C-alpha cells in the first residue's frame, strides 16, 4: 500500500542489525532515474562514517540483514553506499489487482485524527484578496486529502470579524441608513464629527448593545455572503457553518489574559499587558514585549490566536492544527504559539503547524492587480478565467453549453486557477500567468483533464466485462508496464506526503508524471492486441487504475473532470 514505508522500515531494521542506532535514517526515496530502480536507500554513508565503516561495506552488511524476496526482483549496491531496489513484477501485479479491488484504490485508512485546518480567513468589510485566495486553494486541498485519508477534518474559517475598525464601519452604516467603497468613504469621513461617535460606537459594540451588534451582524453577513459565493464558484468545501471568526473567542479572552498574569504576564511597559519572550530578543537583547491586551483595554490578534489554539485543543479536541497563513505572519504565529505552550494550553503532541505560503504576483513581480486595477476583486479574476476558458474551449465545439460546454469551460477555467496555484510549491512566490496556466502542454489543469479523458476513451472505447475484467490476471512483462504499475502504487505515499507536509504540489507532480507515463505506455506499448485477451486485459486493467487514480488524485486537489 505504501512501498516507500514498507522498504523504509525493512532497511532501518537491517541497518540496526548492522550496528546503526535505533533512530537511523534509511533515507529511502523514489529513484530519480529508472536505471537506479524504483527506490533507493540514501543514508548509508552517514551511519557508515560513525560505525567506522566504508559506505559500501556497511551497505553490504546491511544487504545481508535485508529480507526483500517477493518485494524486489533485484537489489543492487551502487556508488558510495547506495542500495538500489528494483521492484518485482509479481509484487506489482499483485498490488495492482489488489488496489483495483478497493474503491479507495487500497489506500490505507490510518488511525483517525481530528484535524483542524485554519484556512482562507478573510476580513469583514475589506475585499477578499489574493493571500486569502491562496490560503483557500491550498488549505481546501489539504482538507480534501485529509478527508480522503479518513480523518475528522474540522474546517476553521478564521474570519477577521472583530476590531476597532468596526466602530467606524458601523457608524458609517448608521448614517447610510462595493465593500472597498464602504470602507474608504467611512475612512475618509472618519478622518474628514464622525470620529467621536465612531470610537464611541466601538465602545458600544464592545458592550452588549444589540442595536450595534445587529449592525455588526449585518456587516459580517454582507462580506460572508459575497465570499461564500466566491467559495462556491471555486468549488471549495468551505461553508458558512465553517466560519469560526475572531469574534468567537471574545468571551474567553479576559479569562486568558487573567490566567496569564497568574503566572506568566506583566503589566510592564506603558500599562497594558505583555508577555516577554527571551526567544525573541532584540539585537540589543531586549525581550519581545508581545501585547495581549492594550492599555486601551482592547485585545489583539495575538490574544485571539492564543484563544483559538487553546479552544481547538480543549473544546474541538484536535490532534493537530494546520494554519495556512501568508509567510509574513510567521513570527506572529510563533510568538502566539510560544505563549500558548508556556501556559500549557496545548501540549507538544498536537503539532500546531504553520503551513506558510508566499505572495501572489503579476506577470513580472508587481503585487498582482486584477483586470482594471482596483483593489483586486476576486469575482473579477474568476470572471476573466471563465471568459478565457470559454473562448479557449470554443475550438472543437459541437455540444450544447447547457451542461456540455459550459461545465467544460468551468472545469477548465476554475481548474486552471486552483491547479496553477496548487502545482507550485506553496512556499514560493507565485507568479500568475494566464497563458502558462490555460495551456495543454505542461503541468496544467487542462492538460490533466485532457489526459484523463484520453485514458477513459482508451478504456471505455474497447469492450467491457467488469466482473470478468476483475478476474483478468494483470501480468507485468514489459518495462513500461512495470513503471506505470509502480507509479500507480505510489499513490498512497504521495497522499501521505501531502498530508504530513501540507504540500499539494507533490500530488500535482505525481499526477503529471503519471499521465506522462500513460502516454508513453500508450504509444510504445500497444493497447489491443497480442496475447488475445490475456495481455489486452492486463493493459486495460492498468489503464483502468490510471483512470481511477487520476480521477481520485484530482478530487483531492479540488479539480473537476469532464469526459469530453
Ligand atoms: N489563526 C489565524 N491567525 N488565522 C489567520 C487570520 C488572517 C486574517 N483574517 C487576515 O486577513 O490577515
Amino acid at each position: 500500500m505504501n512501498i516507500q514505508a514498507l522498504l523504509s522500515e525493512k532497511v532501518r531494521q537491517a541497518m540496526i542489525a548492522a550496528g546503526a542506532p535505533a533512530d537511523c535514517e534509511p533515507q529511502v526515496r523514489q529513484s530519480a532515474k529508472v536505471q537506479f530502480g524504483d527506490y533507493q536507500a540514501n543514508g548509508m554513508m552517514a551511519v557508515a562514517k560513525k560505525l567506522g565503516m566504508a559506505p559500501r561495506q556497511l551497505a553490504e552488511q546491511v544487504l545481508t540483514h535485508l529480507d526483500l524476496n517477493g518485494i524486489a526482483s533485484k537489489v543492487e549496491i551502487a556508488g558510495p553506499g547506495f542500495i538500489n531496489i528494483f521492484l518485482d513484477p509479481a509484487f506489482l501485479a499483485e498490488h495492482v489487482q489488489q488496489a483495483l479491488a478497493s474503491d479507495r484504490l487500497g489506500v490505507a485508512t490510518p488511525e483517525k485524527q481530528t484535524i483542524v485546518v485554519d484556512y482562507s480567513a478573510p476580513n469583514v468589510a475589506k475585499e477578499m484578496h489574493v493571500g486569502h485566495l491562496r490560503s483557500t486553494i491550498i488549505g481546501d486541498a489539504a482538507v480534501r486529502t485529509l478527508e480522503f485519508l479518513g480523518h475528522k477534518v474540522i474546517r476553521a474559517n478564521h474570519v477577521g470579524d472583530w476590531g476597532t475598525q468596526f466602530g467606524m464601519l458601523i457608524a458609517w452604516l448608521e448614517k447610510q441608513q462595493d465593500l472597498e467603497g464602504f470602507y474608504r468613504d467611512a475612512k475618509k469621513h472618519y478622518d474628514e464629527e464622525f470620529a467621536e461617535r465612531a470610537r464611541n460606537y466601538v465602545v458600544k459594540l464592545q458592550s452588549g448593545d444589540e442595536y450595534f451588534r445587529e449592525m455588526w451582524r449585518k456587516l459580517v453577513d454582507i462580506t460572508m455572503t459575497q465570499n461564500q459565493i466566491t467559495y462556491d464558484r471555486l468549488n471549495v468545501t468551505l461553508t458558512r457553518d465553517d466560519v469560526m471568526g475572531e469574534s468567537l473567542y471574545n468571551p474567553m479572552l479576559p479569562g486568558i489574559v487573567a490566567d496569564l498574569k497568574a503566572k506568566g504576564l506583566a503589566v510592564e511597559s506603558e500599562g497594558a499587558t505583555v508577555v516577554f519572550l527571551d526567544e525573541f530578543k532584540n539585537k540589543e537583547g531586549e525581550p519581545m514585549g508581545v501585547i495581549i491586551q492594550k492599555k486601551d483595554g482592547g485585545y489583539l490578534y495575538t490574544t485571539t490566536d492564543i484563544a483559538c489554539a487553546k479552544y481547538r485543543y480543549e473544546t474541538l479536541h484536535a490532534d493537530r492544527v494546520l494554519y495556512y497563513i501568508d509567510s509574513r505572519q510567521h513570527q506572529h504565529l510563533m510568538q502566539a504559539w510560544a505563549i500558548v505552550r508556556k501556559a500549557g494550553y496545548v501540549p507538544e503532541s498536537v503539532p500546531l503547524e504553520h503551513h506558510m505560503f508566499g505572495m501572489m504576483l503579476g506577470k513580472d513581480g508587481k503585487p498582482f492587480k486584477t483586470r482594471a486595477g482596483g483593489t483586486v476583486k476576486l469575482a473579477d479574476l474568476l470572471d476573466e478565467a471563465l471568459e478565457r476558458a470559454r473562448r479557449l474551449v470554443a475550438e472543437k465545439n459541437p455540444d450544447m453549453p447547457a451542461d456540455e460546454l459550459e461545465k467544460l469551460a468551468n472545469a477548465v477555467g476554475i481548474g486552471a486557477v486552483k491547479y496553477a496555484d496548487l502545482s507550485k510549491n506553496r512556499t514560493t512566490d507565485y507568479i500568475f500567468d494566464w497563458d502558462n496556466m490555460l495551456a495543454f502542454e505542461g503541468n496544467t489543469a487542462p492538460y490533466m483533464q485532457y489526459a484523463y479523458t484520453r485514458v477513459l476513451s482508451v478504456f471505455r472505447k474497447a469492450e467491457i466485462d467488469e466482473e470478468q475484467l476483475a478476474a483478468a490476471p494483470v501480468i507485468i512483462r514489459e518495462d513500461r508496464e512495470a513503471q506505470l504499475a509502480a507509479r500507480l502504487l505510489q499513490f498512497e505515499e504521495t497522499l501521505t506526503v501531502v498530508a504530513r507536509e501540507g504540500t499539494p504540489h507533490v500530488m500535482c507532480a505525481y499526477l503529471y508524471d503519471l499521465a506522462g507515463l500513460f502516454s508513453g505506455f500508450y504509444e510504445h506499448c500497444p493497447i489491443l492486441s497480442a496475447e488475445n485477451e490475456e495481455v489486452r486485459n492486463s493493459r486495460l486493467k492498468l489503464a483502468q487504475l490510471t483512470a481511477k487514480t487520476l480521477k481520485l488524485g484530482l478530487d483531492t486537489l479540488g479539480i473537476e473532470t469532464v469526459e469530453r
Side-chain angles (χ1 to χ4, degrees), residues 36 40 122 135 235 337 431 458 485 550:
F36 285 14
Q40 44 197 328
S135 174
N235 201 39
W337 299 348
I431 293 178
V458 159
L550 295 197

Side-chain angles (χ1 to χ4, degrees), residues 118 121-123 132 158 160 301 305 323 325 329:
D118 191 322
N123 299 320
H132 308 127
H158 199 78
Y301 187 47
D305 267 315
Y323 296 77
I325 318 314
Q329 310 209 14

Side-chain angles (χ1 to χ4, degrees), residues 118 120-123 129 132 158-160 246 301 304-305 308 312 323-325 329 332-333:
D118 191 322
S120 188
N123 299 320
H129 63 56
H132 308 127
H158 199 78
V159 177
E246 289 176 297
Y301 187 47
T304 196
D305 267 315
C308 141
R312 284 168 185 175
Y323 296 77
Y324 287 97
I325 318 314
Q329 310 209 14
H332 164 68
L333 295 168

Side-chain angles (χ1 to χ4, degrees), residues 62 112 122 181 190 216 232 249 260 306 314 347 354 362 394 514 539 547:
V62 170
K112 218 194 45 162
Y190 167 86
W216 163 86
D232 283 353
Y249 306 101
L260 288 174
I306 298 186
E314 292 184 7
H354 182 190
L514 187 50
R539 302 215 163 109

Side-chain angles (χ1 to χ4, degrees), residues 244-266 269 271-278 280 284-285 287:
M244 311 172 74
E246 289 176 297
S247 60
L248 190 74
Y249 306 101
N250 290 19
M252 48 190 299
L253 300 183
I256 296 176
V257 161
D259 174 328
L260 288 174
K261 309 180 74 24
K263 316 160 169 178
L265 187 286
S269 293
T273 47
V274 286
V275 192
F276 284 111
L277 317 174
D278 320 74
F280 305 88
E284 172 185 359

